[PDB]
Write an enzyme that holds these catalytic residues in place. Structure first.
Site, PDB file in Angstrom:
ATOM      1  CG  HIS A  40       4.376   6.373   5.991  1.00  0.00           C
ATOM      2  ND1 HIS A  40       4.179   6.304   7.348  1.00  0.00           N
ATOM      3  CD2 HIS A  40       4.616   5.092   5.584  1.00  0.00           C
ATOM      4  CE1 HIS A  40       4.294   5.057   7.760  1.00  0.00           C
ATOM      5  NE2 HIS A  40       4.560   4.302   6.710  1.00  0.00           N
ATOM      6  CG  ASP A  84       3.061   9.288   9.151  1.00  0.00           C
ATOM      7  OD1 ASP A  84       2.473   9.458   8.067  1.00  0.00           O
ATOM      8  OD2 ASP A  84       3.697   8.246   9.405  1.00  0.00           O
ATOM      9  N   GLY A 175       4.945  -2.619   6.828  1.00  0.00           N
ATOM     10  CA  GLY A 175       3.732  -3.322   6.455  1.00  0.00           C
ATOM     11  C   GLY A 175       2.641  -3.097   7.492  1.00  0.00           C
ATOM     12  CB  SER A 177       3.054   1.703   7.533  1.00  0.00           C
ATOM     13  OG  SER A 177       4.462   1.669   7.700  1.00  0.00           O
ATOM     14  N   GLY A 178       0.502   2.695   9.342  1.00  0.00           N
ATOM     15  CA  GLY A 178      -0.855   3.214   9.307  1.00  0.00           C
ATOM     16  C   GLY A 178      -1.816   2.542  10.262  1.00  0.00           C
TER      17      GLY A 178
END
Ligand SMILES: CC(=N)N1CC[C@H](Oc2ccc([C@H](Cc3ccc4ccc(C(=N)N)cc4c3)C(=O)O)cc2)C1
Ligand SMILES: [Ca+2]
Length: 223
Positions: A40, A84, A175, A177-178
């Protein structure tokens, strides 16, 4: 990261900041030429920033390397967030040192109860918005599959796991994320999603890295 603490400059050496004019996602360095992040977080024109602490000040230990190729998992579903995960190849290899280092991929999956370290430059507020300039850290346990599924009925797949606190207050957030979820020195999760941030009975949901090790190894070997 909500309810966390300031990590300290370069204490999480595998942490990366993905930048497209501004920081938009985190990632983990798995070797000198590859970075793992959430699908994402996919974008074109990504610059990978290593050795970062304060993302708005040049402190001296940074390495800014442009991505040469991005590979989103073949079965990524943007609607459910299943699979994801994404790999990013650097244009040039990073110079590994004490402040910039890779994190090991897991040999087996982690179980409920395991304490992990989650990090990122994401939102620090559950209600409201406040983005930190320095890296924040949070220690959180992996929750049982039953608890996870009870919190998110019909939304949890075998490729996801919950971690955090059901009482709320502490969690990763937008923020982050990942970013990495490292348990006992191994990359076990990737910050994926959640309902709100640090809300009661709404723990963070993470990509289960142990299910993708073969895909990762095969992809790096052939690219
Ligand atoms: C609709 C539904 N039931 N879904 C379940 C899977 C998917 O969940 C998402 C996807 C994007 C968002 C973001 C918000 C969003 C984005 C990133 C996050 C990272 C971590 C956490 C956390 N609390 N640990 C929450 C985040 C929330 C949005 O609103 O756009 C939030 C949840 C859709
Ligand atoms: Ca900096």
């Amino acid at each position: 990261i909500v309810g966390g603490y300031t990590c300290g400059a370069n204490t999480v050496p595998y942490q990366v900041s993905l930048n497209s004019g501004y920081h938009f996602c985190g990632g983990s360095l798995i070797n000198s030429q590859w970075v793992v992040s959430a699908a994402h977080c996919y974008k074109s024109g990504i610059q990978v920033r290593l050795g970062e602490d304060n993302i708005n000040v040049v402190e001296g230990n940074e390495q800014f390397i442009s991505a040469s190729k991005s590979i989103v998992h073949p079965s990524y579903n943007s609607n459910t967030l299943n699979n994801d995960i994404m790999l990013i190849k650097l244009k040039s290899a990073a110079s590994l040192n004490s402040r910039v280092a890779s994190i090991s991929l897991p040999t087996s999956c982690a179980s409920a109860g395991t304490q992990c370290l989650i990090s990122g430059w994401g939102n620090t507020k559950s209600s409201g918005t406040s983005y930190p300039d320095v890296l924040k850290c949070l220690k959180a346990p992996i929750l049982s599959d039953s608890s996870c599924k009870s919190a998110y009925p019909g939304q949890i797949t075998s490729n996801m796991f919950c971690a955090g606190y059901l009482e709320g207050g502490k969690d990763s957030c937008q923020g982050d994320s990942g970013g990495p979820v490292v348990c006992s020195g191994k990359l076990q999760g990737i910050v994926s999603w959640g309902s709100g941030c640090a809300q009661k009975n709404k723990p963070g949901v993470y990509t289960k890295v142990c299910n993708y090790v073969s895909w990762i190894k095969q992809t790096i070997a052939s690219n």
